[PDB]
């Protein structure tokens, strides 16, 4: 509370450590850090059972590619959903390998350096 009309020396008793982004003193270091919140999602998403990308835009994505291949094509609801689940798990399976590639280079986040290595080993690229 030394003041000085300078933030991080200003008053934080008017503001709050408990989620009050109003300018003041330095917040509490944890601050629901991205690691903690991410652990909440991975625990929830690896336990739940639901589709995790939008349905109609994915159907529109297939329709866009289908139109170029065939001028007029008829689709089924099951066929689009069947493609989605394989497509959803494709990036899920890749991310498992992509995460393992990151740990190899003493890294925690996935980067475009990982995707080129993972796909080539699988035989998808080159």
């Amino acid at each position: 509370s030394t003041g000085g009309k300078a933030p991080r020396k200003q008053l934080a008793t008017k503001a709050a450590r408990k989620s009050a982004p109003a300018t003041g003193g330095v917040k509490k270091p944890h601050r629901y850090r991205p690691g903690t919140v991410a652990l909440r999602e991975i625990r929830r998403y690896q336990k739940s059972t639901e589709l995790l990308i939008r349905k109609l835009p994915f159907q529109r994505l297939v329709r866009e590619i289908a139109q170029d291949f065939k001028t007029d094509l008829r689709f089924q609801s099951s066929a689009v959903m069947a493609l989605q689940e394989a497509s959803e798990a494709y990036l899920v399976a890749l991310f498992e390998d992509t995460n393992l590639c990151a740990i190899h280079a003493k890294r925690v986040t996935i980067m475009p350096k990982d995707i080129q290595l993972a796909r080539r080993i699988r035989g998808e690229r080159a």
Partner: protein
């Protein structure tokens, strides 16, 4: 880096180095600009004429210092030791990087209430005969922290209690009665 600029005009420059004796405090050539910077006593800083005057006590009139100041400013910018302010209100006012940290601009209220009480403290006793006393109206806590009366009152008690020297405590009843004596002179009664 031609001869007519490296040997023909050089002898003047190495001959006059580290000899600002007349200003005894920090006579070093690199420290003259900085000494002016602390001596300016302003938020904006020192402009060209201000810094020239503040450096000029002796030993400096400017046969080549007019351009040497610009060259030294370029050197200090390459060193990254200068912070300044722009605008026409301050015609190129310059400051040395004295950890007066830069930060976001918004939040400038058009008053300084905390220091607004100082002019009244300067004025009232000075308007009286009893001159401006020592800074006792508010203690060092005023710029230690910024709080109200209970927290600004409990802390002086700790200030006095932690200093347990009885001999030191004797002074608070020998330096203060001088004010009591002067209260007879400045107002005629009470």
């Amino acid at each position: 880096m031609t001869e007519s600029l490296v040997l023909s005009p050089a002898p003047a420059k190495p001959k006059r180095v580290k000899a600002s004796r007349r200003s005894a405090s920090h006579p070093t050539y690199s420290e003259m600009i900085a000494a002016a910077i602390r001596a300016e006593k302003s938020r904006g800083g020192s402009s060209r004429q201000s810094i020239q005057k503040y450096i000029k006590s002796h030993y400096k009139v400017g046969h080549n210092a007019d351009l040497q100041i610009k060259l030294s400013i370029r050197r200090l910018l390459a060193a990254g030791v200068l912070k300044q302010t722009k605008g026409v209100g301050a015609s190129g006012s310059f400051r040395l990087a004295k950890s007066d940290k830069a930060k976001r601009s918004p939040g400038k209220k058009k008053k300084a209430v905390r220091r607004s009480t100082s002019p009244k403290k300067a004025a009232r006793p000075r308007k009286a005969r009893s001159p401006a006393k020592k800074p006792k109206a508010t203690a060092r806590k005023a710029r230690k922290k910024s709080r109200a009366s209970p927290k600004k009152a409990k802390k002086p008690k700790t200030v006095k209690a932690k200093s347990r020297k009885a001999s030191k405590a004797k002074k608070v009843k020998r330096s203060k009665p001088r004010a009591k004596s002067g209260a007879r002179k400045s107002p005629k009664k009470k």
